[PDB]
Structure formats: C-alpha cells, structure tokens
Amino acid sequence: AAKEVVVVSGVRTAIGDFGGSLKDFSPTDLGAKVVSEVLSRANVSGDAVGHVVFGHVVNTEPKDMYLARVAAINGGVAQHTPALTVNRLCGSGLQAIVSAAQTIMLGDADVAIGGGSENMSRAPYTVPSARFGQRMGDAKLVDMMLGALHDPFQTIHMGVTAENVARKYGITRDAQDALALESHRRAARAIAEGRFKDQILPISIRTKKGEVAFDTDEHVRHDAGPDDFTKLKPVFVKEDGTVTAGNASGINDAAAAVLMMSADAARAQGVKPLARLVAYAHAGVDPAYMGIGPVPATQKALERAGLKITDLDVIEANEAFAAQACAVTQELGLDPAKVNPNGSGISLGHPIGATGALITVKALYELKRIGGRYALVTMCIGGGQGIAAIFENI
Amino acid sequence: AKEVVVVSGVRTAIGDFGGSLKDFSPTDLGAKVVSEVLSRANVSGDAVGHVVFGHVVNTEPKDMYLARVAAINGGVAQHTPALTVNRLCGSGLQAIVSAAQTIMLGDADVAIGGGSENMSRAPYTVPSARFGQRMGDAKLVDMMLGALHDPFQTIHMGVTAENVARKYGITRDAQDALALESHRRAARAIAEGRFKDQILPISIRTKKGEVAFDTDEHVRHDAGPDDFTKLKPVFVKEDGTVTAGNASGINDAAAAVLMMSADAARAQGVKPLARLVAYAHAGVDPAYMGIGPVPATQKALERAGLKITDLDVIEANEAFAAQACAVTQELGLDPAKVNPNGSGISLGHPIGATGALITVKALYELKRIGGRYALVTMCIGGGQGIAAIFENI
Amino acid sequence: AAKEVVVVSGVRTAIGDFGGSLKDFSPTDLGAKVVSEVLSRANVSGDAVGHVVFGHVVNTEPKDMYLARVAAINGGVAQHTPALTVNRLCGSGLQAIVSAAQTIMLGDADVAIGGGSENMSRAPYTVPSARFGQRMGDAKLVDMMLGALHDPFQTIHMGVTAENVARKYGITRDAQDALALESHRRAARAIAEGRFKDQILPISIRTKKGEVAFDTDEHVRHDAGPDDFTKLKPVFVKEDGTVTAGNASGINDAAAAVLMMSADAARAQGVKPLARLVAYAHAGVDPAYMGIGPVPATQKALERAGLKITDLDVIEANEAFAAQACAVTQELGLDPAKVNPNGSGISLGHPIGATGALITVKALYELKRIGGRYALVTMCIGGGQGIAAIFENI
Amino acid sequence: AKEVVVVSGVRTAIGDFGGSLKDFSPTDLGAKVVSEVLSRANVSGDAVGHVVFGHVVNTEPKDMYLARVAAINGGVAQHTPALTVNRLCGSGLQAIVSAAQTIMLGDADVAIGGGSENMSRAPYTVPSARFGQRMGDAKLVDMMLGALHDPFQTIHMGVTAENVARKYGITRDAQDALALESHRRAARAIAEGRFKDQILPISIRTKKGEVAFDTDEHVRHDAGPDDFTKLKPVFVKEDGTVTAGNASGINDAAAAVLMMSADAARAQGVKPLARLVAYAHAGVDPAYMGIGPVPATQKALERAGLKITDLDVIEANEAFAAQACAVTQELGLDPAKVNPNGSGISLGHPIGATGALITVKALYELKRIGGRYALVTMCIGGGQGIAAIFENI
Ligand SMILES: CC(C)(COP(=O)(O)OP(=O)(O)OC[C@H]1O[C@@H](n2cnc3c(N)ncnc32)[C@H](O)[C@@H]1OP(=O)(O)O)[C@@H](O)C(=O)NCCC(=O)NCCS
Numbered sequence A, C: 001a002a003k004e005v006v007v008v009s010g011v012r013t014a015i016g017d018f019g020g021s022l023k024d025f026s027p028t029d030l031g032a033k034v035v036s037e038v039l040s041r042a043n044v045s046g047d048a049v050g051h052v053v054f055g056h057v058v059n060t061e062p063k064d065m066y067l068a069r070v071a072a073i074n075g076g077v078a079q080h081t082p083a084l085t086v087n088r089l090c091g092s093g094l095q096a097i098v099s100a101a102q103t104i105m106l107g108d109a110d111v112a113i114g115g116g117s118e119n120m121s122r123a124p125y126t127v128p129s130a131r132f133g134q135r136m137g138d139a140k141l142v143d144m145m146l147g148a149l150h151d152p153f154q155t156i157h158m159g160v161t162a163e164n165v166a167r168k169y170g171i172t173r174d175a176q177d178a179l180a181l182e183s184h185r186r187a188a189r190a191i192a193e194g195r196f197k198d199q200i201l202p203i204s205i206r207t208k209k210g211e212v213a214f215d216t217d218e219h220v221r222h223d224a225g226p227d228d229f230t231k232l233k234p235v236f237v238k239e240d241g242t243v244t245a246g247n248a249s250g251i252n253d254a255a256a257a258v259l260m261m262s263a264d265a266a267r268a269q270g271v272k273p274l275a276r277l278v279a280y281a282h283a284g285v286d287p288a289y290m291g292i293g294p295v296p297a298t299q300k301a302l303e304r305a306g307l308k309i310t311d312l313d314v315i316e317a318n319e320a321f322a323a324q325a326c327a328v329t330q331e332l333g334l335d336p337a338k339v340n341p342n343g344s345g346i347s348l349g350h351p352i353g354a355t356g357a358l359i360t361v362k363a364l365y366e367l368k369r370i371g372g373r374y375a376l377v378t379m380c381i382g383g384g385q386g387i388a389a390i391f392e393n394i
Numbered sequence B, D: 001a002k003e004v005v006v007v008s009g010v011r012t013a014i015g016d017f018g019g020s021l022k023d024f025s026p027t028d029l030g031a032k033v034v035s036e037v038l039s040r041a042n043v044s045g046d047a048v049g050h051v052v053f054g055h056v057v058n059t060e061p062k063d064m065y066l067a068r069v070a071a072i073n074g075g076v077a078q079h080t081p082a083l084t085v086n087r088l089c090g091s092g093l094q095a096i097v098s099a100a101q102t103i104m105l106g107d108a109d110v111a112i113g114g115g116s117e118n119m120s121r122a123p124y125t126v127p128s129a130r131f132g133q134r135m136g137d138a139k140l141v142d143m144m145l146g147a148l149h150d151p152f153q154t155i156h157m158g159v160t161a162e163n164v165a166r167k168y169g170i171t172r173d174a175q176d177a178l179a180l181e182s183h184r185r186a187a188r189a190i191a192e193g194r195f196k197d198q199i200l201p202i203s204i205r206t207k208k209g210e211v212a213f214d215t216d217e218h219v220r221h222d223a224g225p226d227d228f229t230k231l232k233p234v235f236v237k238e239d240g241t242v243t244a245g246n247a248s249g250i251n252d253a254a255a256a257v258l259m260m261s262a263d264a265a266r267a268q269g270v271k272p273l274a275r276l277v278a279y280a281h282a283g284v285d286p287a288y289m290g291i292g293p294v295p296a297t298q299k300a301l302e303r304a305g306l307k308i309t310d311l312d313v314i315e316a317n318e319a320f321a322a323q324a325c326a327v328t329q330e331l332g333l334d335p336a337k338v339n340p341n342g343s344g345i346s347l348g349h350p351i352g353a354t355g356a357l358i359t360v361k362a363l364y365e366l367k368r369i370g371g372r373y374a375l376v377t378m379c380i381g382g383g384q385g386i387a388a389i390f391e392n393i
C-alpha cells in the first residue's frame, strides 16, 4: 500500500499587492525564504530532505526555470536533494504538495518539501520577433501575465469563463458582491484577532526610511461596505456583466511551503505535526467553465477519503471569482460559514502559483485554531481543471 | 504500486535551431505526438487518466498551459487532468515518471508522458516593461541562453562541462572522438532506417510545395575526425576543450509515450512495447551537474536489483562529450551499448523533450536487438540526474 | 540688405515635470496648441503664414518626424505653408526662431512662425536588434532620452561637461547652490505676482476628478531654503563632484512659439508687437566644455548689434547647470540681477527642444514688464555649441 | 544676399535595405562625405562657417547630434556650428538651402550642406518602456515604416501616390514604362562610368577580404518590361497601380556639397562646380504630396527668371512612378532631360540624403553635357515640395 504522509510544518509570506510591498522580491528569493523557515519550524536539517517540489506559473527571469532548485539550495537544502518545478496553473501550489507527498507515498523519500512561489508584479513581457527580427511593420510586446490569465483555446480572460459559470449556475451580481464583501470582513477580523500571526513569515522590506517588516496581507479592505462593490462596473464583458474588480480575486505576490514526512519518520522523530494527508483528487472540465473544476475534484477526493461533505470542519476553496466560488459552494452543498472562514483570493489576494500551498497552510492552522478534524483544500484551474486534497488534524 | 507498461511511443524528427520546425509552437508539436500515441495504441481519447508534459522554455502564453493544450488538441477528453513539469534537461523523462506514478498509485489506468520544446522560438523578455525603466538603458533578456546558465554562478552549462573534464580526465581528443562516432552512429541509423518507425513525419509547408520533415537534420553524414579537431573551444578562453563540435546542439522537437496499468493493458488487447522497472533521482554539485547520471543510474540499478552488465541498451544523453565520456567512464559501461545510434551531439538536444525522445529510442532499439533491459538517463542543469530502467516485453 | 523682423506675438505652455502634468500630451499636440494661440494673439489668419519652423530633439513617435507640419496643420495653418523641423539640441527652440526669421530676412516670407516642442516624459526606448534580430545573447533597450543627454564624442552625460566647466572656471558647490536657490525664489515670486499669466496658454488636463487647467510651472519649489540644496549629493561624478539634482536643470515637457512678420507687413497691419530682432549669432566650442558656448555666441551677437553687455536690460541665459550658468555670467561680466530675473531651467525646467523658444517668450514679456529696451536670449548646446539672439522692445 | 557657389560635392553609392551599408551609421557616413568634400575643394577644416545635414530617422542617440558628429569626425573644427534639419524627403536639399542661406546672409563664407540616412538601421521603439505598460500587450513601433506614413490619415506614402495617379491620369502601363527606363538609364550610366567621379567608395569589410562598395546596388541591369507588369499592387487591395517595381526603394547613403561666397571662392583659387540661382518651397494637400514639386518648381523658375525650356538637366526624384509621371506631365518637361541617369526607382531613395545626393548628380551631369541650368526638386511627405536651380560655371 501507500505510505501515510504527515505534514509537520508550514509557513507563508504575507501576500503582496500587484506593484506592492513584495515587488522587488524575485520568486526564487521568496521560495528560498519559505524553505529555510519550514525547515526551522519542523526542526529538520537541510541535509535530510529527500525531495523538493515547487509550484510556479509565470517565469520572471531565467533563474525561475530552476525555481525549485534555487529555492532549495538558497533555502539551505543540501545539493544532493532533487528539486522539481511544476505548473498546473492556479492549482500549482497544491500540486507541488501532492507531488512531494507522492515521493513519500511511493517510498522515494521520507522527507519532502512542497511549496509555491509567484511574483506577478515581476511578470515580464516577451518580444517574439526579437531573436530573428521583424524586418518591417509593427510588432508586439506580449504580456506574459495577462497571457497566463487567458484560456488558450478561446483566448478569453479567466473572467469571461467566470461569467459563463455565473450564467449557468444562476449566480447574481448581488450574490457575488455579498461574497466579496464578506471575504474582506472575514480577512479583516482574522488580521485584527491575530489569526495569521503564527503562520506568516515576516519579510524585511528595505525602505528609504529604514527597514520595516511586511507581515500583513495588504490587499484586504478593512472598512469595506456594500456600496464599495455595488458602485463598480463589470470588467470582462461589455454586455450583461456581473464580474467586477471588486468581486474578482486580485493579482498578487507571495510564497508558501509545507514540510512533509512519512508517518514512520514523524513517529521516530517525535514531531508535533500539523496534519496528515487523507486523500487528493484531480478533475478536468469544460475550459469555458473552468471555475466549477473544484466540484468534481472535491467529490472524487471525498470518495477516496470515505468522507462526506458534512465531515469537513474547514474548507479553503480559493475565491478566484465570486461567480465561481459561489457556484462551487452551491453545487457541493457546503456551509458558507465553514468555507474560507478568514477570507480568500478576493480579499487576501491570489498569487497564482503559490495560492494552493498558501491556502493549505491557512487550512491547517485554522483546524488547530478551532480544534477541528478534517479540512478540504481545493481550487479551479485555467484550461478547465480542478484539484482537491483533504487533511486531518492530528 | 501497480505495474506500468508502455504500449506506444513516438517522436518527431529533431529540428535544428532556426531550422525545419522553427514555425511549430511547443503546444502544436505536443498535440501532434499526443494524437499519434493514442492512435498507435488504439486507445480512445476518452480513456486517459492523466497527461504530463516536460517543457522548460515558455515561448508564448499558451505554453504555460502546455500539457492541457497538447492533450485537448491531441484528442484527449476535457475530463483528463494535465500537468506541465520542469526538471530542466530531465523534464522529458520526469514527465514519463510522473505519469507512471499516477498509474502506480492507482489514480489512473492510462497516462501519457511526453516532452516538447522549441528553442528556436525561445523569447527575449523585458523585465522592466511592466512598470517601466524610467531612465537608463534596459536589458532585453535571452531566455534561451538564460536557461542554459547555471543559476548559482551564472556560467554556461558548457563551463560546468569543462569542470567535469578536468575532474575526471576527459581529453580534447577523447571528446572529439565520441563526437565523431556519435555522428557516424546517427548517420548509420538513418541510412539503415532505424528511426523510421519511431518518427512522426511533419509537413513543413515550403514554397517548393508540401515537404515532409522526417529526418533528424543535425546529423553530419560526411563527418571526419579533422572536422572536430579544427574547431576552437567556446566556453572558456584558455585551457579549454568543449567546442561547438563536441557539444550538443540547440534543437526543437516533441515526443510522448502512452502507458497503462498491467491490468488495463491486458483488458484491452494492446501489445505493450516494454515495462517500467525502476527510476531514481540524484542531486550533485551544480558546478559538476554533468556527472548527475552516475548516482541516479547507480540508485536505479539498486532499486531494480540489476547490474550494469544486465543493460542491453543505454540511452545516456550526450549534453557534452566532456560529460558523457565521464559518465560512461565512472559507471563502467560498454561504449558499444551506449547511444548505439547517436545522441545529443549528433541528433540534437531539444531540452524539455529530450528525456521523452530518448526513451522512445531506447525502447525501439530494444525491439531491434531482442534485448531485455534498457537504461535511460541524463544530466540536469543546476546539479541533478535522472534515470529509468525499462524491460522489453 | 536684410529685411527687419518683428516679433508680433508669443506664447508658451506652462512647463510640466518629468512624468508630470503634460505626460499624456504628445509633442505635436503641444505644438498645435501654441500655433493656434500665437495666430490668435497676432490676429493673423492661418491662411496668411509663409513658413513654420519648430525645434524638437527627441522623437517620441513617427508623427514627430513631421512635427512642424503637424503642429502647423493641426494649429490651423493652411496646407500651402511650408513647415520645417530643426534640431540643434538644447538650442533648437531659438534656432527655429532664427530660421523662421531668416525666411523673412531673405524675402521668402512676410509671415513666419518659430517655435519648439518637447515631451521628455514620452521619450522612447529603441530596440536596435529588433529589425534584423539578435539570434543569441542579451541585447539592450536604448534610452533615447538619456542618450540625447550624452556627449556623442566621449559618451559622458552633459552633467560631466558641467563639472569640467565648474573646474576650469572656478565655480564652487556653494556658488552653484546659491544660484539654484535664487532661481527657485525668483520663479516663486514671479508666480506669486502673476508675472507669467499673460504669456502662458492654459491646458485642460482631463483628470478623473474632472478637467483642470494646467497653467503654472510645476517644477518650482516655493518654500526652498539653503539646506535643501546642501544636503544633496553629486550625481554625475564619483569623485570631487559639485553638480547635483538640485543645481541641475530638470527634465521637462513644454511647447512655445512666436509669430514674426517683416517690418513692412507689421506696419501695414498696424500690429502692436512685442519686439524686433536685432541680431543673432552661433558659436562652436570644445564639446567637453559645451556649457560656456553662450560666451562666444553672446560676444558675436553683441558685435553684430553694435551693442555692449551694459546695454542689456534683460538676459535669458538658460540654466542648464548652475556650474555653467555661473561661468557664463562670470565670463561675460553680466549682472546676476538682470540674468534670469524670474528663474530658468533649474527652477522652471528645461524642455530641451522648446526651451530656446520658451525663454524668448519670457524675455520679451519681461522687457514689457520693466519698460526695458534690449534683451539677450542665449543657451548652451550639447556637442559644444552656443546660440544667442538680441531683441529690442518696440 | 551674397552669391553662393558650389566648389565641391560627393556622394556614397546607394545601399539597398539590409545591404552593403547596413553596418554604417548615419554619423559614420556623414563624416565620410564631410572629409571628402573638404579635400576635394582643398579647404581647411578650420575655415568652415557652418555645417547643415538633412536626416529623418534617428537610428541611435548620436543621430540627434548628426550634423555635429559628421562635422567633427569629418575634420571640421570645433568652432564651427552644426545643424540637423528635417523636411522629410526634402531634407537633403533643405540642408543645402539652409547652408546657402548662412552665406547669403553673411553669417559665413564657407558652409557644408549634406544629408545622411541609414534606413536599414532604422529602429523599433517601445513608447511604453519608460513608465511601463502595467497590463495588456504593448506595441513595438517600426519607426521606418512610421516615417513613410502620412501623419494626418496614417496611410502609406504609396497610397498618396495612388491618389495622384487617379487625379492626373497616370496608368499602370505608364508607371511601369518609367520604371523600366529609369533602370535602363541607371544601368547605362554605371556602364559608361558617369557616376565614377561623384561617388566616394567605401570599404565594406567582408569575410572574403576588403572589398570596395562604389556601385549603386539597387539597379537592375537586366530589366525587361515583363519584369514590372507581372508584379502586383502593394498599397491598395483593389483598383491599384503602385507596385514594388515602379516604386522607389528603401536605401542607405550620404552626400554633401561644400559652398562658399563668390568672394571667398575667388580669394582661394577654387574652380567652382556651379552657382546657386534660386530655391523655393511649396505646401500641398497631404493626400497628394507627390505633386509638391510642381508649384515649388514653378515658384523657383519665377524667382530665377527662367522657363522650363532653359533647364538642361532636371533631377526630379522618382518617389513613385505614379508621382514622377504627373510631375513631368504638369510642368511640361522633356522626359529625355529628366533623370537622364535614373533616380529613386532604380538608384534608390535614402530619404534624408536623397536631396543632397541628386544635387551632386545634377551638377556632375551639367559638366558632362556642357549645360547651363539644372533643376533639383522632390516631393515631401505631409504635403510639400522643394526646388532649387543651379548654374554651371
Ligand atoms: C479584475 C482585474 C482585471 C482588475 O485589475 P486592476 O485594475 O489592476 O485592479 P485594482 O485593484 O488595482 O483597480 C481596480 C479599481 O477598482 C477599485 N476597487 C477594487 N476593489 C474594490 C473594492 N473591494 N472596493 C472599492 N473599490 C475597489 C480600485 O480601487 C481601483 O480603483 P482606482 O483606480 O480608482 O484606484 C484584475 O484584478 C484581475 O484580472 N483579477 C483576476 C485575476 C485572475 O484571473 N486570477 C486567476 C483566475 S482563475
């Protein structure tokens, strides 16, 4: 059978705004930071790591094609450790955790780090005609960030697929704005109560007035009210729109990681862990409706775990767009009070390749906060996919 | 862990930098080999549990969706998950491993593993373009050359090949020797038609009409030892040995294999090419990445319960003659069994697709000689190696 | 002999900061604005113009290679009028006036417009390898703005030549900072007293809060004191520097123009003009000391006019760098009280191709303000030149 | 207004787009013709009162200093003022006019007027690069093609040539006729060596050694009427006539003339080529800019007190056959006296240098036929024309 996977430690950066506090930190710099910190939290030597896997979508510089290896080596992991970068779009961060967990399940490693790192502020433009020349006529610089946010089959923004989902599943503008407002209020309450303090790694952000610690998610609106969202206009369609800048997730910068071990290695070391991995699942859907990806992925994961929706104490289902996040909660029959109890992509931001790892960290720390047992982590995936994993607080 | 069988495989011919495939995007090449492996195995596009593609250098936004685009446009149903993986030059074998693991773990009965890379279309980036440079000249960054630079010392992969040449005693004469033979083995393979069955031809619409690209165009068919010893070292100015002639080329290509669980294969009447025996990974000093295959291979043989002398076929990619010689040397391999039909130096090195492409070669060579065991291994920029062993069945 | 040239009207925009209030206004848009306004001030039909000449240095878009013609046609000048763009670097704006005056002197036109337009905020980057490709290796985007500010023989910033002049002519840091502070105080006094109101054309700058009129030079520091300049560090040399961001001219955006006529056409029409052109002169100097260009150019112009330094009531000598502006005043024996009485490039900005026309407008309006008789307009020129003209209030 | 004499002149051979001069910057070419005109006239670099160069498309930062760089690196003293002027395709004749005016007004006794343009090196710009694009694709702007677009309707100069073809009745057969003859006149001139004395050879360092570029390489020496009537219209899709064959090329070159006051020439013993008789400017409808030469020429003849039949040589640049035919037609010129040795269609159109270059041709042709009066005129994008008349002396 497959070895049991224990999540012993986890950490995330605070999430930076587009062009904001982390704009000068490369994806490999952020990844190295969370690698070194998870090792310290788990009391694991950098020489004792069997595998490193990082999720990451938008290469910002040549180093990023080496992202997992640079994050590992600069995070203090020995050079004998293999390192893999994976890309499943917005599912990449949770995919990294699954792929790292798989090396343990299969006996290839007793210790593995899975994380994600993304700096969208530093996403580049390309010049396709630069290598061999354009000769004559105007050419383009291609926005690789916006390009990543376009479905590659119809060349429509993710936000257009969110309208497709809104229309198909009956998710009104008012429903979307209610979810968005509530996400910000939940995030502001979590910040005010200190719910995120233990799971965040502060970053010193060298300012001209001296160094200051960036340790709070800066996308959150702390005094938001209903009229802030009603006044906004739809951003992705010219007719009959519902998706706005306020009820869509942000574009953001962050990194996060967990350190996992075989259950036997965790017993022998005597660690006091966060959780164990119960099950995971993948699904594919119509690309034009990629936002409901989490529905089949969650149903499959629950089947593998032998659990039911009502067994879930904590659900982190990323708010890519209120339009799809509502449809997911509705189609699954989830209690909105248990779903994203401290906010999600709309209020905290959506650093795409890191999101899936960062919301895993959130989920496991929330289980500890409430003494809960099972958490579900799931998210939708551009191109038409879903990914889901279930963890047990132990 | 379920048993994993390869039922089909295919590759494109390997295009030169700026050559016959320069107009074919990585997702275009990927979809072509996906469709072809399904039809070779006679497997419905609706029956695929997972698709994994290796790929390193994004040439356009669609490339961040590469596996999904290759799968959908290759005829795989939208309900199949798709993953792109990047372990640099090991990415193509990694995709096959990652796809096999979905089968081993019971997540899927059928999985496609492949790789796709178009280095000709590798882009230049402008890191200052989004928020501006404000004042002062700015950089147009060669993402292809940057992929070929170690990220810790910012030296070309070829500088690490020189390091490996010094440490292990690989001479210039030795490097040019392997390079010449590789070209001679490749030219012989092409003449005898050894690659015919494993290559998917591609129509490369020319002004002269509609021609088929089905031959690896990097090969020098008239090569003589003088051709290599005249060239000059290109990566270190003095006391150097790696040249353009004894180093792999920059190339474009795609390849894939389709795998199934043993049970699912039985239950479909599909004559499997081979079976997966074992795989392994290794990390090494980045400055000496070219020696990564040695520990990875040793670790793979250990897991397989096999010895070097049990290998009838070895596909060990020739990133640099300086590195490939030291691999063969440190492992104790018979050079007649290693890359018997050429490799990176002669056939080219389409980095993200290479590991999948030489897996296809290794398996077709096993069938050609009636062998049992084949080893596939390659080095990895940044300091790693990857290796896999297959059994002809 | 040569016909006498009357300056009947003139106008300038307010000067915008780098990245500031005029950043969205192209050079041909600004030029068209001042063309239409000078025609209106002089009561001259757009169908009665014999020639248009504009100074302009840094092309921002393809239209700018047609700059004079676009400014003329869009400013309401008939299509039968010839239009010429000239480039003598920072002397271009006054060169345009001289070249336009020359068509009148030679009997080619009885009416001619001379102006300058520059938007440095919109200066582009080029990609030299884009047309035919780079093939392999990194390339560069070339800053055409900074490039224009580099001497083309030694590839040193204009600011390095300013240090050369400071050293050769004994212009201390304290002397440079005294000039800079005084320039801002003079500009702030002129603004507070309304000295510039009649010569500036307001521009409506479409903001999100509604339209607002940009009519005040925004580079001026109104509460400047000596310590603001002493604290700054030298910007152009690593050793023994004196030139700073505070005592160097700014990078700026603006346009300006005058309308001239033959004296006979001015008599017949009965215009009430600003001034007449008395003389002009050019000079070349060592490129490494281009900042003293105005000295020989001024001496030559005075000789042609049969005037002496002491006959000058108003001097507009552009403050490119305090280092050279001091050396010019010192070598010529000018009274600093008469030189740039209302500020200059350090305080108001230096929109290079427009500066020479804009400070001509300043000079002629200042003559009217004080009832003076003769004004000198002069400036230094990258590559090692000077240009000067003398005008008489009539 | 003092009398202005031309004592010397020179031009480069005209390079094709991407051809033999592609590696020579505009300031490099400018300095070469500056040095050569000084030495041809035997005039000290210290004796020059003014330098003016026409030039349209900045290829690099130094180009904004073009006249000054051409003058200094061409041996002119640093005390000489230097001006760059831009009247689009008239810039090269404008520079000669502007330089002559400094002499006419007594500001100078000696002045150089020239032009320099390297369209091959014309750049792409990124208007968003300084302050950033933030989000969304951005433009890489072709500054060369943009220079060839009218700024009011954003149509190619060739679209205005079609407008001119309709208004004045210039047929396709008529255009291809002029194009063929131009090429035949140019090929004859080159064969007979007519351009030998006016061309400054340039060494264009090749891998085959050190070769001299001294022949206008746009010329088709084997041209036959079938070559032009087979080509298709390129600027309007339907009901079109201007083709790649009957339109001028995109080209690189430089040229200059040195002028002095009559007195200063006498006082130096310098045998002057010719004398400036008159010049004139005209504005026209931008949509019909190609007809600008007609009023400019009429206005120049009026000032000169001459008639069309007094002109022994006419250099009227062939921007487009459609436009040049209408110019000759509306002025009533003998086509045997107009561009007797080819022009823009056959020799090329290095825009900023053209007006200076064809002035050199016109003067050398006057000496070759013993003529008296020569006319130099050309059209101007945006709707202008410029014309000058010289007297052989
Ligand atoms: C929606 C989107 C196009 C907007 O981009 P943006 O303009 O850069 O976003 P910003 O927050 O900076 O600006 C939005 C504007 O609405 C306003 N706004 C946004 N949220 C608001 C809120 N909760 N309350 C009030 N106003 C709000 C901003 O203040 C701002 O107004 P301003 O210009 O006056 O300052 C972008 O965020 C996006 O694409 N999001 C989803 C990305 C995605 O697809 N992720 C993966 C999907 S699977």
Ligand SMILES: CC(C)(COP(=O)(O)OP(=O)(O)OC[C@H]1O[C@@H](n2cnc3c(N)ncnc32)[C@H](O)[C@@H]1OP(=O)(O)O)[C@@H](O)C(=O)NCCC(=O)NCCS
Residues within 6 Å of the ligand: B089, B148, B157, B158, B220, B227, B228, B231, B234, B243, B244, B245, B246, B247, B248, B249, B250, B319, B349, B351, B379, B380, B381
């Ligand atoms: C070595 C390298 C820098 C050279 O690149 P390149 O110069 O553009 O390649 P080219 O073949 O176009 O040019 C090389 C020259 O040597 C010659 N040459 C190359 N191989 C030759 C051979 N086997 N025999 C004789 N001559 C040869 C070419 O003809 C060519 O000469 P030419 O320009 O006159 O026609 C590049 O191929 C490279 O980086 N290879 C290694 C790739 C790599 O790092 N892979 C992954 C690392 S793990």
Ligand SMILES: CC(C)(COP(=O)(O)OP(=O)(O)OC[C@H]1O[C@@H](n2cnc3c(N)ncnc32)[C@H](O)[C@@H]1OP(=O)(O)O)[C@@H](O)C(=O)NCCC(=O)NCCS
Residues within 6 Å of the ligand: C018, C090, C149, C158, C159, C221, C224, C228, C229, C232, C235, C244, C245, C246, C248, C249, C250, C251, C320, C350, C352, C380, C381, C382
């Ligand atoms: C000097 C130069 C390189 C500085 O460029 P810059 O950094 O963009 O200029 P800025 O005014 O925006 O910034 C300068 C800094 O000094 C400070 N500063 C400038 N002038 C100041 C003053 N009078 N008092 C106090 N502080 C001042 C700015 O506030 C700013 O500080 P900050 O970053 O904390 O806000 C540039 O202005 C230049 O090149 N000038 C001369 C151009 C030229 O050569 N023209 C033609 C020559 S012939």
Ligand SMILES: CC(C)(COP(=O)(O)OP(=O)(O)OC[C@H]1O[C@@H](n2cnc3c(N)ncnc32)[C@H](O)[C@@H]1OP(=O)(O)O)[C@@H](O)C(=O)NCCC(=O)NCCS
Residues within 6 Å of the ligand: D089, D148, D157, D158, D220, D227, D228, D231, D234, D243, D244, D245, D246, D247, D248, D249, D250, D319, D349, D351, D379, D380, D381
């Ligand atoms: C017309 C124009 C757009 C064509 O540009 P181009 O296609 O890059 O020029 P090329 O010569 O490389 O290609 C044209 C094709 O027609 C053919 N051709 C051109 N002239 C020919 C001729 N006289 N006879 C036969 N064939 C000819 C070329 O061989 C070539 O064919 P190929 O590509 O198979 O070799 C460009 O030359 C142009 O814009 N000219 C006008 C310039 C201008 O506007 N000047 C100022 C205006 S006032």
